[PDB]
Amino acid sequence: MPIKVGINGFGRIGRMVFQALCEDGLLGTEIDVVAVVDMNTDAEYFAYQMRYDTVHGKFKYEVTTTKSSPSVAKDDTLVVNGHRILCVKAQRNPADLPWGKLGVEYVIESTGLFTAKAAAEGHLRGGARKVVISAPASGGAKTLVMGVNHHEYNPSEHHVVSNASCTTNCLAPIVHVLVKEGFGVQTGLMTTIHSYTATQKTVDGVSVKDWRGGRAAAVNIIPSTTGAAKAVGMVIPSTQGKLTGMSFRVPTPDVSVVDLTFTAARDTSIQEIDAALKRASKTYMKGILGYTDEELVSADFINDNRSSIYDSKATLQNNLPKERRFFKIVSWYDNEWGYSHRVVDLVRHMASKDRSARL
Amino acid sequence: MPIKVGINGFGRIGRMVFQALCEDGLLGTEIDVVAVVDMNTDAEYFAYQMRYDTVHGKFKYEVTTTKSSPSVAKDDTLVVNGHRILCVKAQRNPADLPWGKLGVEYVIESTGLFTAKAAAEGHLRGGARKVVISAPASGGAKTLVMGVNHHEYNPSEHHVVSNASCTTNCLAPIVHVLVKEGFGVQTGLMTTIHSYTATQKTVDGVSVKDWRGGRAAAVNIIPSTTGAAKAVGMVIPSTQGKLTGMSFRVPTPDVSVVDLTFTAARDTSIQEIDAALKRASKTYMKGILGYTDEELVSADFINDNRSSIYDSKATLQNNLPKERRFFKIVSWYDNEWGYSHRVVDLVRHMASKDRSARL
Amino acid sequence: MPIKVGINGFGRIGRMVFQALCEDGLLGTEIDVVAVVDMNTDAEYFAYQMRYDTVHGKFKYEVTTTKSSPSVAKDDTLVVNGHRILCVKAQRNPADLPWGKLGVEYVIESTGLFTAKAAAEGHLRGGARKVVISAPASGGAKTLVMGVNHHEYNPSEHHVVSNASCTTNCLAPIVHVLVKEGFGVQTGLMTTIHSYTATQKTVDGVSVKDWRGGRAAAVNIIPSTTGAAKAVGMVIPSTQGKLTGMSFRVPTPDVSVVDLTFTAARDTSIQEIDAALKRASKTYMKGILGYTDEELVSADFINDNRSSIYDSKATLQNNLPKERRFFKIVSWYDNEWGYSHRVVDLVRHMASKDRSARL
Amino acid sequence: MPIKVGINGFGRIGRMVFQALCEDGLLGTEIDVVAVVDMNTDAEYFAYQMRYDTVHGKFKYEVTTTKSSPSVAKDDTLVVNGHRILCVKAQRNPADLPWGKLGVEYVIESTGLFTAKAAAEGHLRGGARKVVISAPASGGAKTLVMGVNHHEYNPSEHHVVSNASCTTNCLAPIVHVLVKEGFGVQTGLMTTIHSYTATQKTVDGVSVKDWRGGRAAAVNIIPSTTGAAKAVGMVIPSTQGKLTGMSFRVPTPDVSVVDLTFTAARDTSIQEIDAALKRASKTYMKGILGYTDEELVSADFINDNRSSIYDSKATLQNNLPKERRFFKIVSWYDNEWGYSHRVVDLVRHMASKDRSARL
Ligand SMILES: NC(=O)c1ccc[n+]([C@@H]2O[C@H](COP(=O)([O-])OP(=O)(O)OC[C@H]3O[C@@H](n4cnc5c(N)ncnc54)[C@H](O)[C@@H]3O)[C@@H](O)[C@H]2O)c1
Ligand SMILES: NC(=O)c1ccc[n+]([C@@H]2O[C@H](COP(=O)([O-])OP(=O)(O)OC[C@H]3O[C@@H](n4cnc5c(N)ncnc54)[C@H](O)[C@@H]3O)[C@@H](O)[C@H]2O)c1
Ligand SMILES: NC(=O)c1ccc[n+]([C@@H]2O[C@H](COP(=O)([O-])OP(=O)(O)OC[C@H]3O[C@@H](n4cnc5c(N)ncnc54)[C@H](O)[C@@H]3O)[C@@H](O)[C@H]2O)c1
Ligand SMILES: NC(=O)c1ccc[n+]([C@@H]2O[C@H](COP(=O)([O-])OP(=O)(O)OC[C@H]3O[C@@H](n4cnc5c(N)ncnc54)[C@H](O)[C@@H]3O)[C@@H](O)[C@H]2O)c1
Ligand SMILES: O=C(CP(=O)(O)O)[C@@H](O)COP(=O)(O)O
Structure with missing residues (x-):
């Protein structure tokens, strides 16, 4: 089954984590990126940014935009190969994200403003079940490094962890x-x-x-x-x-x-x-x-x-x-690259290790 | 009598303006820099920024710091060869600057956020008489360029001008x-x-x-x-x-x-x-x-x-x-450099023209 | 009918002209690179320069090296995708290259030291037919520009051109x-x-x-x-x-x-x-x-x-x-890119016209 | 009797050594630059390279050029702050240098082509007394680092040294x-x-x-x-x-x-x-x-x-x-700067030592 993911803060790493998924081919397949969330909601601008990269070249998949509702000014939805990613309005308090309503259970916290264990745990109230901080955390958050200790991950204890x-x-x-x-x-x-x-x-x-x-x-x-x-x-x-x-x-x-x-x-x-x-x-x-x-x-x-x-x-x-x-x-x-892929890996490894613990 | 000057926004141009003042031997004579303002009031850090410059090299003149009053936590006063300069706390609204209580009449608006004649006029309400905008202004502010049209300065008709x-x-x-x-x-x-x-x-x-x-x-x-x-x-x-x-x-x-x-x-x-x-x-x-x-x-x-x-x-x-x-x-x-010398050139001109209007 | 080409000055543009051919699937097919040339004849070093590029990324076609006779000290053959290229010895005079024996009629002159009509003509005495100057020429050399005047090419008049x-x-x-x-x-x-x-x-x-x-x-x-x-x-x-x-x-x-x-x-x-x-x-x-x-x-x-x-x-x-x-x-x-591609274009056009010019 | 020094190879380092040498205020007083030797004799182009520097700013002393004899095609004399320096035509063999005639005892090796003990010894036969190679040297030439072991300088033993x-x-x-x-x-x-x-x-x-x-x-x-x-x-x-x-x-x-x-x-x-x-x-x-x-x-x-x-x-x-x-x-x-000054340092040191061992 698809993994309902939500990327928090679609910035440099946010876009690289997303492009990681695509490169590996996990979009609308293994991972369902239901929504990203940066400063604005100008999908047309988000497209341009993903489309062109000073160092990493041109995105291999074509990007396009559309409206979530005919009653919208500028396109607010991103479209990557059939899949439709929504651009929600950023927040100051993670506890105020529509994760629950959107259906997101795994959020990749990459704003840089929520590395604090409890700050990132706000995403949980929003309706998410697991959060992955794309940077060193604080607050007893479990740190996991792919190919080194990601197996220590524990489905019932670790709900907010760091990829370091x-x-x-x-x-x-x-x-x-x-x-x-x-x-x-x-x-x-x-x-x-x-x-x-x-x-x-x-x-x-x-x-x-x-x-x-x-x-x-x-x-x-x-x-x-x-x-x-x-x-x-x-x-x-x-x-x-x-x-x-x-x-x-x-x-x-x-x-x-x-x-x-x-x-x-x-x-x-x-x-x-x-x-x-x-x-x-x-x-x-x-x-x-x-x-x-x-x-x-x-x-x-x-x-x-x-x-x-x-x-x-x-x-x-x-x-x-x-x-x-x-x-x-x-x-x-x-x-940028390597780490971004590790982000997808950690997330994937968790979903599988989360599935088992349940069904 | 020196003219009391205050520099709002002590960065690239705010600092080069100051260095130009020291360089031409105007500090403490033609111009008396009463205070500078930026993010905080940590004079010690202001010294560091003034002392070392990636493109203009080491600040040729010595700079130390002291306290305005013992009841101050960390140093808040810059000292350039006897000349003392107060580091005031940045202000979201220019009108909230303690100019009238400092003695500052001319303020070089170089924060970069108040280039709107209306928003920059807040320096007048703060207690200042004139304001030179270190960038293209808007709102009707008269725009003067030294050596080209700077004589079109009307002591009584221009209070918030743009140095272009x-x-x-x-x-x-x-x-x-x-x-x-x-x-x-x-x-x-x-x-x-x-x-x-x-x-x-x-x-x-x-x-x-x-x-x-x-x-x-x-x-x-x-x-x-x-x-x-x-x-x-x-x-x-x-x-x-x-x-x-x-x-x-x-x-x-x-x-x-x-x-x-x-x-x-x-x-x-x-x-x-x-x-x-x-x-x-x-x-x-x-x-x-x-x-x-x-x-x-x-x-x-x-x-x-x-x-x-x-x-x-x-x-x-x-x-x-x-x-x-x-x-x-x-x-x-x-x-960076020339334009900063012009900002000083302009203020100086304005000073003479303001001194000859009522005298 | 593999066209016969000889790149002289396998450097920045020489290599780009080669990666230009490959990109268009012209190697072996439409065009046949008999042998390139630069300062040395170290295929391991040539292969290396080709494999990795700071601005244009990694070469998309595996490159290896072999010999032409065990009596050789180090590999001197450049096998690019099955097709093999020879690394001839550099000469201070274009006329000293074994173009004749090598059986190389067209010679992409990209050393940058023979932009002179006569100078580049040394390639013709060495046994070559047509010589394209991957740079502005001088000495009465016909200058062509794909899509602007390239058809002005007279198969039986212009044996040495300049791709500008x-x-x-x-x-x-x-x-x-x-x-x-x-x-x-x-x-x-x-x-x-x-x-x-x-x-x-x-x-x-x-x-x-x-x-x-x-x-x-x-x-x-x-x-x-x-x-x-x-x-x-x-x-x-x-x-x-x-x-x-x-x-x-x-x-x-x-x-x-x-x-x-x-x-x-x-x-x-x-x-x-x-x-x-x-x-x-x-x-x-x-x-x-x-x-x-x-x-x-x-x-x-x-x-x-x-x-x-x-x-x-x-x-x-x-x-x-x-x-x-x-x-x-x-x-x-x-x-670097576009131009190199024009070089090949002019070479393939000269062939197309040269061919029918007497056949 | 100011020391008579001559720079061999007026390149990026030959200049730095001369600029550092000028900075210390030794030109004419302690040391006396007789003549510099480089590929070309174009003095106007030398005064240029000395006048401006991308990293070290502008040379503080004035630089002009003249001719050593009215019978000279172009300028051959470089005049720095009054002091006169002749620009001799370069060479590939340190012997063919007129050091002795020029009255040059100390020559600074910065050509980067004679880092060898045996090679660089030509200056000695060129009438030159001592030689300080401004780069690592071979042929078992004595290495000296100012402030570390420069006191291991034996005048009557070492005549061709390296400054590391x-x-x-x-x-x-x-x-x-x-x-x-x-x-x-x-x-x-x-x-x-x-x-x-x-x-x-x-x-x-x-x-x-x-x-x-x-x-x-x-x-x-x-x-x-x-x-x-x-x-x-x-x-x-x-x-x-x-x-x-x-x-x-x-x-x-x-x-x-x-x-x-x-x-x-x-x-x-x-x-x-x-x-x-x-x-x-x-x-x-x-x-x-x-x-x-x-x-x-x-x-x-x-x-x-x-x-x-x-x-x-x-x-x-x-x-x-x-x-x-x-x-x-x-x-x-x-x-660039530190080392250049050290080169002057090593030479100044050697001199004084040679003066006391000889006098
Ligand atoms: N070298 C790297 O790129 C790198 C590598 C590994 C880990 N990291 C870590 O990843 C995090 C992000 O780094 P980055 O390189 O992508 O930085 P970035 O500044 O390029 O990206 C962060 C993005 O977050 C957005 N943002 C800020 N506040 C927000 C909010 N409240 N809501 C939504 N979006 C918001 C910004 O618009 C910005 O584009 C940092 O914590 C960093 O230390 C970075
Ligand atoms: N650097 C140049 O080439 C240049 C040349 C001419 C004119 N200008 C103009 O000068 C102005 C400043 O440019 P700059 O190069 O110095 O940029 P800068 O970013 O280096 O300077 C702005 C400074 O203002 C401080 N600041 C921000 N908000 C503030 C506030 N509310 N109160 C007080 N300080 C605040 C910042 O910390 C920063 O140090 C802009 O209007 C710019 O367009 C710049
Ligand atoms: N790169 C560009 O932007 C560009 C674009 C169009 C035209 N050109 C022209 O193309 C020419 C080469 O440009 P480049 O960027 O490739 O320069 P380059 O210096 O990078 O390449 C020339 C190469 O020729 C080799 N070489 C020198 N003498 C040689 C000889 N006698 N025999 C064989 N090889 C020899 C050198 O090792 C060097 O790598 C110049 O004349 C330039 O004006 C350059
Ligand atoms: N400043 C530094 O970074 C530095 C520090 C330590 C040692 N070195 C060494 O010192 C040497 C010179 O350094 P540089 O920075 O000047 O290098 P450079 O390459 O910038 O300058 C060398 C110059 O020597 C001139 N030259 C070459 N052969 C000559 C000859 N036969 N006669 C006259 N002039 C000749 C050339 O015109 C060339 O510009 C090199 O061997 C370098 O490795 C440099
Ligand atoms: O590389 C990092 C720290 P290092 O340079 O000391 O290894 C990493 O934290 C990047 O963080 P950013 O916040 O994206 O700059």
Whole structure:
């Protein structure tokens, strides 16, 4: 049966999560996106936005609009291949969404204004049954990372959960292979050369929550603390309090890369780690962790759906020779694409794990 | 006696205006900046923004902070070499600004949200006498452009004037020399290759009133309609209805260039015009109109304070040989820097004219 | 009847011309690439450059490499979809290439160092029949433009042609409609906001041939002269010495746009001109001239094979109202994609005519 | 008797060395630039390159040109603030240089073509006394990093030395304070988020010795194996085989930052370290090592002339709380400016030393 989904806040990620569904072919098939919900309800504008993307190209499916009722000014309904997505009027209080009336049970919370466990739980009153925050949450919300711990998901306990962050979903799969393969992680420090995002600015402007982040983004290397490496602990309890790291926001519109440096728990070799990474990318991490041994550069990872793309050649070429513990692993990720697909995955995995618990 | 000034909206232009004041040694002499206003009153953060500038480099003059009164939580007063400046809390409604209790009579309206004669008049009700809008205004506000029509200022008839746009300010100087030297302007279409600004988005974001204006700002040549060229009709009435243009927002944090095409009212030559422009920049347009004959690029115009820098070589080298009517005039400008010096130039003018009206 | 082609200068445009063939399913079938050529003969590196592209995405046809004789040090054969290409050794003189023995009659000269009639003719002495200069030629080389004058090709007269400049291929299609649709062009100046190219520098460098051209490309707006507006006269004589213009190289890796300002021979409106362009694009200029009525930006025209894409909105919205002679036309173009496609088009047309020319 | 220096290879770096040299106010007084040597002799084009800079702003001193002898075709003399500098015609062999005749004892190697000890020795036979290669050198040439080991300069032993690279001059000061202050370095991996350089390309082009380095510079994050780290084992032998790292070339014209990670040789805290670096910057590292505790971004380091600017905030905030061995240190540097000044520093040092050993 179709999954009645409702996307909250049809922004950059909102549109990427939706386009994820389509790409994978889950529209009007496995997932029923009953309604999206951003600032306005100008379906014609929503069409244009989905249709054209500066970095990800032109949407592969044709988009069109229509009215939900002949008594409407501008088209208020989006049409993607027979399926009809409604654009409802945004809200300030999730508890005031027509989710119940619309028939939505799973909402993807991607506004960015409801990452608080209880704030997102407002969608439940609205009539939804499960919510997935497309970012790190707070309030004891369960954090799940596909291919790492999504199986810990519990249908009767977890109703508001987080898919975590783009960087966490990129780092986690590497730390996970390391620990599961027995290499271990004593202590680790990571840096992420990250492409600027919507939170940043075009020219120097006011940003009281992050002074460096208000500076002209496309012409600066902006440092920033991140809780991504420390969030790995939530997903891999064994590495709790053992990792941390920063981020250097740099002048590229999309795609980033993880720079991990850690000390293995036991003696090994970089060749050994390299081989363990590739082996899992083809097995238990397939579709989540991938790798490459080609001389690629950020642009080559655009539209890659893996959560983490290990860079074999950058890794094998920049470590200490004969070193048995102090290592560096490099991995790429399209911050927008990969994560967006993981959002659909987590949601799907939940619906299936929710079905079973019932019928 | 110095004139009490207050700057509403301390950003790109609010700050460059201040830096221009310090630079020309006017602070504490011709002008007494009583206070600035933005999001909060954290002087310490205001210092940081003033101290470091991504495009204009380190603020050459020292800046520290203190408290207006011990009963204040964090510092709220900026101190630039003895000159103290108060950081007031932003106001949703201009009429709610404590001007009359501060002593401020002139307020440079640069927040960007009160360009409507009616909405900007709120500064008068707050307790101020005059208000200069750092952008094209509406509502009847008299529009003045230094070196072109700024003498049409009526001390008693104008209380909320518009210093025009940055572009109008680069164009006017030229169209004035043409009209004044008798070259005349039959018809003209301008195109400004404008570097992006704060109203643009780092990544494809929401922008309902200007769709293309929402697409990624540092990786796209974004077209846009502009009033700048038309506005030249308000400063030089004989051109009203003869010009109009557009803007292409390209990937540069500062400095723009006007590409003016037009047909003269009489038979002339690009040489005659070239020589007319340089001659003018050395005479009646000195300070306002500048010009170069060197192989310059945008960065070379960074921090140039003129309103228009005629590019001799670009013009002469790219026109039709022997033509006597159809010409192209290229002229650069630091959309941030010069225009800011003009805002100060304008206020100063208004001050003298207001001092000589009742005296 | 696989046409015989030999690409000399397998670089930015050389590779694009190749990916141009494949895209149209002409490889092996209509056209047969015997052997390409650049500095080295490393097929692994060639294959790599082909597989991944920063602006145009990933190559859609698997590429592998083999040998032609085990006596070779590294793979020197480029197998693209079953069809195999040979990587010949670069020469300082076009006449030194084994075109004769290689059995290569047509040779797409895209090195950019032999835009001279005689120079490129070195290809004919090496054993080749026809030589197309994927760039503006000089020395009495017939310049053709698909959809504007390409039929002027004399199979038995023109053995060396010039497919003109990427800019002329965008302007001409536009001017061609104006002249033919009876609008006429009295005088015109054209400016092109062009994105940087391989001839520029990453950081300030030496460029004695073009001082401005030797300045940090990705952070400046470099002015530049151009002969594309003047070259139209060689393709549309009616305009001889009636058009010219410049270039403005901005910070973008690909896609450029024309901004033609001109006066019509007779009276009209922007509507009539807009209507003619949309008409011509759907009829006698289809495939060459296209148009858009959407809020598009630079990146949206990435991979557009048309030569000129007229921007309806940007044109109707930025001209003088009720005006009858002075006009501005805004037209886009993927300076890399479209052009490359025209190169193949001219090559296939020359074959079609060469064939029947004696058969 | 001011030192007679001659610059070999007046390129991006030859200038920076001369501009830095002028900045310190040494031209004519302490040092005396006799003549510079570059491919071309065009002095008007040299004065241009010296007059304006895309990143470092405009040269503060006046630059004009003349002729050394009335019997000279074009200008061959570059006159900087009164001081006279001759522009000798370049060469491919360091021997064919008239250093001795020119009376040049100290020549600065920035051509980037003679980084070899044996090769660069030509100057010596060219009558030139000593040679400072402004880049990593081979052939077992002595490396010297100002503030780290420049005191290992033996006049009668070293006549052709290397000033190491820009990155090493950033890492060395940091590692030197760590080793000399008791912390020690057991193992360490560095990463430099580096801005693109001249060796990179605007758009995807041919780069056989570095494939990723051939990709478009201002639109990608290009990884790269680096030596700087390992080259530290030459300046601080004790770390021989203990360090290494890579590089991420990001979209910025200038300014880079070093992100070093390592395990101390004893127990400490990120505070002890932080204090030790600040103490050193104020004492024995003054001028070479500097630090900041403000919220800085790359643009804020433009024109800083220290070799390493430690980022106190970025460091203290991104290390594991209570950690004792595994640490991250973030340090900035104007990869162009700092190094340039160091080159002058090494030369000034050598001089004084040579004066006392000879006198
Ligand atoms: N790199 C990425 O794009 C990325 C990757 C992973 C996770 N995330 C997280 O996902 C969230 C969204 O990120 P994004 O890149 O899409 O940002 P965005 O700013 O591009 O998208 C957020 C959208 O929310 C809409 N919005 C705001 N308030 C709303 C409201 N009350 N109701 C409805 N819509 C509202 C806005 O119009 C905006 O388009 C953030 O929490 C971010 O940290 C982002
Ligand atoms: N930067 C340019 O090129 C430029 C040139 C000429 C004219 N202008 C005009 O100047 C004005 C400001 O432009 P800018 O570049 O400085 O933009 P900006 O965004 O950098 O400056 C606006 C500032 O006002 C503050 N602000 C917002 N609402 C406020 C309120 N209610 N009260 C007080 N402060 C408030 C913001 O925090 C911000 O710092 C606009 O009207 C713009 O059109 C800009
Ligand atoms: N890319 C565009 O926008 C564009 C569009 C139309 C026409 N053109 C014209 O096409 C020509 C090439 O442009 P491009 O963008 O491909 O430049 P490019 O520099 O990227 O490609 C030229 C390639 O030729 C190779 N080369 C140099 N000398 C050679 C020789 N003797 N033999 C074989 N290979 C050699 C180089 O390795 C280089 O990669 C220029 O003349 C340019 O004016 C460029
Ligand atoms: N500023 C930096 O980023 C930096 C820092 C450290 C080391 N380096 C190294 O220093 C060297 C120069 O650096 P750069 O920034 O000037 O590079 P660049 O490529 O910008 O400048 C090199 C210049 O050398 C000139 N040249 C080449 N061969 C010559 C010859 N035989 N005679 C005279 N002139 C000649 C060229 O005109 C060219 O412009 C390179 O080897 C570089 O790797 C650069
Ligand atoms: O990448 C992120 C943090 P990092 O750069 O420190 O790894 C992620 O939170 C993006 O958030 P946005 O709110 O969409 O900017």
